[PDB]
Each structure stands twice: as structure tokens, then as C-alpha cells.
Amino acid sequence: DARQFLIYNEDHKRCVDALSAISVQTATCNPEAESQKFRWVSDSQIMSVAFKLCLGVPSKTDWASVTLYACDSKSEYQKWECKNDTLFGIKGTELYFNYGNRQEKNIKLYKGSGLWSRWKVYGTTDDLCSRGYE
Numbered sequence: 087d088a089r090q091f092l093i094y095n096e097d098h099k100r101c102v103d104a105l106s107a108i109s110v111q112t113a114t115c116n117p118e119a120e121s122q123k124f125r126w127v128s129d130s131q132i133m134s135v136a137f138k139l140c141l142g143v144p145s146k147t148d149w150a151s152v153t154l155y156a157c158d159s160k161s162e163y164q165k166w167e168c169k170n171d172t173l174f175g176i177k178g179t180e181l182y183f184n185y186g187n188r189q190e191k192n193i194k195l196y197k198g199s200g201l202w203s204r205w206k207v208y209g210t211t212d213d214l215c216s217r218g219y220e
Contacts, residue, residue, distance in 0.1 A: 094207070
């Protein structure tokens with residue numbers, strides 16, 4: 087489906103990989119891997135295709151793990167937005183979708199806004215919102 091896409095980090099040359107509802111890490115990009123497919127299901131939520139769950143966090147806290155939760159349009163812990171230059175993070179806060187620090191395999195919310203908090207739709211140079219709505 088045109089809506090489905092892969093979340094890519096240029097610096098690491100890796101894509102987001104959903105392992106389970108409590109584990110979202112990264113892996114060598116493969117457009118054929120369901121676990122690597124995601125899709126916007128609203129103006130602010132991204133759903134894992136393999137698990138039918140939405141990317142979210144336990145709280146809007148630095149280093150909070152980003153895993154999967156039952157999609158809920160009323161929840162703010164699973165709402166995302168695009169910043170500038172492909173910077174991606176939690177809607178309304180200065181915490182970003184991040185990977186690469188402290189040998190941590192799972193995606194984390196981080197205050198740093200460098201190359202590790204920037205992501206593109208795999209196969210393009212556009213931010214994630216280019217495959218969503220709004």
C-alpha cells in the first residue's frame with residue numbers, strides 16, 4: 087500500500103524495526119519485511135503494519151522508550167509531528183525519535199536534535215510526514 091513506508095536514518099543507514107509490542111529497534115533496511123513497515127493512521131499517529139499497534143511512549147520523558155501501544159486517538163503519548171529538516175518527535179514537546187546513543191537498541195526519546203533524531207521515508211529525502219496527512 088502506497089501509505090506503508092520504512093522509517094530511515096541516513097547516518098546509520100538503518101530502518102526502524104518492530105520486534106514486539108515492547109520492543110522497537112533498528113535493522114538493515116528491507117522493504118519486504120512487514121516488521122519494518124509503518125503507516126500514518128491519522129494526522130498524528132503512526133501504526134506498525136506487522137503488529138497493528140501505534141508507536142508511543144510511557145511518558146513524555148527524556149530517554150523514555152518508544153514501543154507499541156493500542157492505537158488510541160485520545161492519547162497524547164502516541165502523537166507525533168515533524169520538526170525541521172526531517173527532525174521527528176513527540177507532538178508539543180522538544181523530545182525526539184532517536185537512535186544511536188549508549189549502545190541502546192530500542193528507539194528512545196532524546197533531547198538531542200542531531201543526525202540521530204532525524205528520519206526520512208526510505209527511498210526518498212522527505213520527512214516522515216510526506217507519507218502521512220497534514
